[PDB]
Design a protein around this nucleic acid. Sequence first.
DNA 1: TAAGGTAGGGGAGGAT
DNA 2: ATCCTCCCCTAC
Length: 428
Amino acid sequence: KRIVACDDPDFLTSYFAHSRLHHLSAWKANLKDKFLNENIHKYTKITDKDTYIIFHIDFDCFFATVAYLCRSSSFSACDFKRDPIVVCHGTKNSDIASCNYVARSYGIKNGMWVSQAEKMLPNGIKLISLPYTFEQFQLKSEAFYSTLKRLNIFNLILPISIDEAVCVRIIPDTLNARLCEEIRQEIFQGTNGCTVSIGCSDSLVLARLALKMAKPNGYNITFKSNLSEEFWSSFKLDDLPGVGHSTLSRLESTFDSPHSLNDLRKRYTLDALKASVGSKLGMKIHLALQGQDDEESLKILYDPKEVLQRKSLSIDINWGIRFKNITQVDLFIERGCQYLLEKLNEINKTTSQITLKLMRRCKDAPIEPPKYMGMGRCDSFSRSSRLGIPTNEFGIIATEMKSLYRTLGCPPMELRGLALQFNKLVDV
DNA sequence: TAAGGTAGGGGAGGAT
DNA sequence: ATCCTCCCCTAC
Ligand SMILES: Nc1ccn([C@H]2C[C@H](O)[C@@H](COP(=O)(O)OP(=O)(O)OP(=O)(O)O)O2)c(=O)n1
Ligand SMILES: [Mg+2]
Ligand SMILES: [Mg+2]
């Protein structure tokens, strides 16, 4: 018990073993890799000439579901269908990694703090908190992916995440529903109690929206020609791929707070969109509202091997960072470079460009954040350098990293987050 | 207390 | 116009 501090040689090890966000990233990176290894010898790209159907498959409230099926006996009293359940580490300003649909019926969301969530529960409803079961999340993911390959349904299976895949059926020149039902059934069995939803369409965007609409353990079909106002009206603006908190806020400020995608599509003009959120994004939203994919989004189908090929490598620590002097910082940077170099050498690459980025306590922010050991409100400072020659040498890299830190001049006591990045990777 | 990581599109504004 | 650095955003 008692958390390993940031000045301890195995801080990274212990922090990563506990951080679900690090797991998410690590699992994602490994899956991309596995895809590249399994397809070294397989013609893989899809063309303009090709006709295809997208089946976007995702586990429902993934950690919550798995953590519940694997729960210790002191929680046997729990009922997934009637009780609000979440997976998290703590009791107050702790992230709810995943919450079940009963919890969502009260307004609880993934990403919300436990303290926030409990305020949303009416008298007589108690929040149930489950621990993370990382190894089990991984075993269910493996079953999911092997099961997909085993049915011999798809021409290609793109791993998006530990619980999500974009599967493609190429159609040469009703069945879809039977297929959706088979996949859901076999995955439910190959996984034991887990559930998966499916969005099926002729565009990646619609498949993703259909997925959201199908979500509570089901499937939804919807093609470009099935679009209706009832379909639009059912989505929040940030249900669009590529639209998060800021884009939402900008869309709202520009088009008189539209509440559903239908309201947005009835009010927008391409030009205003572009002025509001960027053009490409504006352009992406524009196409999405007509059920069409932007070119950027399509590269993953026309060339998965290049899209899935890792182009950078880094660590980003923003919790538990508390230092008193530059010596501790230097040692931390050194260890960070040692960790990254282990990774770099594992994927047989060198780097020609590095970046040190840091989070510094804002002038106006409290010295200790509302969140225990959190970074709190901070300002970003970043600096990069081109290395003369691609290298994997600790000496060159660590020395430049330490040098970049002096240039940004953040007093150690103000440091609250730190990122070490290898931006351009060169081969062999 | 509680584990706020990371890859990789993008755009602003200064350098060419 | 294009390219580069230092961010911001989103995704999961
Ligand atoms: N802010 C977040 C979002 C997600 N995740 C983890 C928890 C989830 O189980 C998993 C999957 O992301 P999803 O968006 O797919 O979350 P769910 O699968 O839990 O919800 P849904 O049923 O809406 O797909 O990754 C997390 O730790 N923190
Ligand atoms: Mg999911
Ligand atoms: Mg997912």
